[PDB]
């Protein structure tokens, strides 16, 4: 399952005639595109590898 979430503030005069506004005209734009399932877990680092990436000398 994939989730696309959007939030922001829109000026009414930036909305086009077809009730559309580009995402670059939204003030506090919060855009999120995430997923779950084993596909999403396959894109997470292992805990040991994350620990090393954060605490290894090099």
């Amino acid at each position: 399952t994939e989730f696309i979430r959007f939030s922001g503030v829109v000026n009414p005069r930036t909305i086009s005639g077809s009730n559309s506004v580009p995402s670059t005209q939204v003030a506090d734009a919060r855009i999120e595109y995430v997923g779950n399932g084993y596909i999403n877990e396959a894109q997470n680092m292992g805990w040991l590898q994350r620990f090393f990436l954060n605490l290894s000398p090099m």
């Binding site: 005069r13 909305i15 086009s16 005639g17």
Partner: protein, 54 residues
């Protein structure tokens, strides 16, 4: 009735006001709007203010 015609009262003065506008209802004798981009730009501004987005 001569002093009023020879002098002016201090503080009793006139100022000058200026502004920009659009004149509509002409019989094909308006701007060409190809050599005057501001006419179309301000018409679009007025339409957007009124709720129409060209």
């Amino acid at each position: 009735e001569r002093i009023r015609d020879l002098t002016s009262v201090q503080g009793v003065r006139e100022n000058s006001l200026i502004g920009y506008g659009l004149v509509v209802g002409l019989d094909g004798t308006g701007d060409q709007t190809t050599q005057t981009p501001f006419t179309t730009q301000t018409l679009n501004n007025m339409l957007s203010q009124l709720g129409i987005t060209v």
